Amino acid sequence: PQITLWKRPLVTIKIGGQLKEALLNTGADDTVIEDMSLPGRWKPKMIGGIGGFIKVRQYDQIIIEIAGHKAIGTVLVGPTPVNIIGRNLLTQIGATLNF
Amino acid sequence: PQITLWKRPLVTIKIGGQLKEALLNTGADDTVIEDMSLPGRWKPKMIGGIGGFIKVRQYDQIIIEIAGHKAIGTVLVGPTPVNIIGRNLLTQIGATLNF
Numbered sequence: 072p073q074i075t076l077w078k079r080p081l082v083t084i085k086i087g088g089q090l091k092e093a094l095l096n097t098g099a100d101d102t103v104i105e106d107m108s109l110p111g112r113w114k115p116k117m118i119g120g121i122g123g124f125i126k127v128r129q130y131d132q133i134i135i136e137i138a139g140h141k142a143i144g145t146v147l148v149g150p151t152p153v154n155i156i157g158r159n160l161l162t163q164i165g166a167t168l169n170f
Numbered sequence: 171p172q173i174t175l176w177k178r179p180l181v182t183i184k185i186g187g188q189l190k191e192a193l194l195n196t197g198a199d200d201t202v203i204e205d206m207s208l209p210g211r212w213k214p215k216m217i218g219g220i221g222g223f224i225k226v227r228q229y230d231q232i233i234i235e236i237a238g239h240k241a242i243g244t245v246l247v248g249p250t251p252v253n254i255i256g257r258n259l260l261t262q263i264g265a266t267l268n269f
């Protein structure tokens with residue numbers, strides 16, 4: 072689809088067997104999901120942006136369904152107020168910016 | 171142009187006669203520019219990043235060129251690791267997300 076940017080580009084994702092709203096985020100390297108349980112091994116990570124850094128749990132090889140499109144990749148879980156789909160997954164979906 | 175997201179969507183901007191690089195960010199409402207001098211009066215603003223809130227200087231109706239596209243609008247100035255073009259300006263240059 073073509074998403075206009077008048078409003079937040081929010082989409083419904085599916086991850087860990089749960090439906091969620093998430094922000095399509097071209098300015099995010101990583102995909103960051105509000106704290107939840109995911110299966111498999113994880114390791115700690117520090118990620119930053121405006122306002123400094125938060126500590127998160129990194130899970131690798133995680134399937135996510137993004138607006139109906141399946142993709143697999145690393146997923147970060149932590150204290151974010153907004154679920155964020157970053158470039159690591161937006162590429163798998165073939166998302167581009169156009170103007 | 172059509173911009174894939176395998177790398178960071180960095181473009182050149184021109185603001186205050188100065189050339190800078192900035193990040194095209196669909197996940198951001200506002201545009202945040204590293205500390206620089208801009209004409210006119212400014213108003214206060216608190217914005218929330220991933221790491222928490224920072225105080226920034228809000229300048230309105232500022233002329234800014236983004237990848238050869240002219241925009242005039244609100245620019246926030248404050249500590250940021252990266253210049254960020256938010257949706258307020260992305261809509262001015264007709265940017266869309268497509269997949």
Ligand SMILES: CC(C)(C)NC(=O)[C@@H]1C[C@@H]2CCCC[C@@H]2CN1C[C@@H](O)[C@H](Cc1ccccc1)NC(=O)[C@H](CC(N)=O)NC(=O)c1ccc2ccccc2n1
Binds near residue numbers: 100118
């Ligand atoms: C710009 C502002 C108005 C403050 N809005 C936001 O920042 C909103 C706030 C939302 C609510 C809180 C949780 C995050 C979301 C998404 N963010 C936008 C979101 O797009 C934000 C924009 C950004 C990019 C780079 C540097 C600073 C800021 N990206 C990010 O925060 C991602 C997080 C990540 N590790 O994936 N940061 C980065 O991808 C990134 C890039 C370069 C860096 C250089 C030095 C230090 C840190 C760096 N972080």
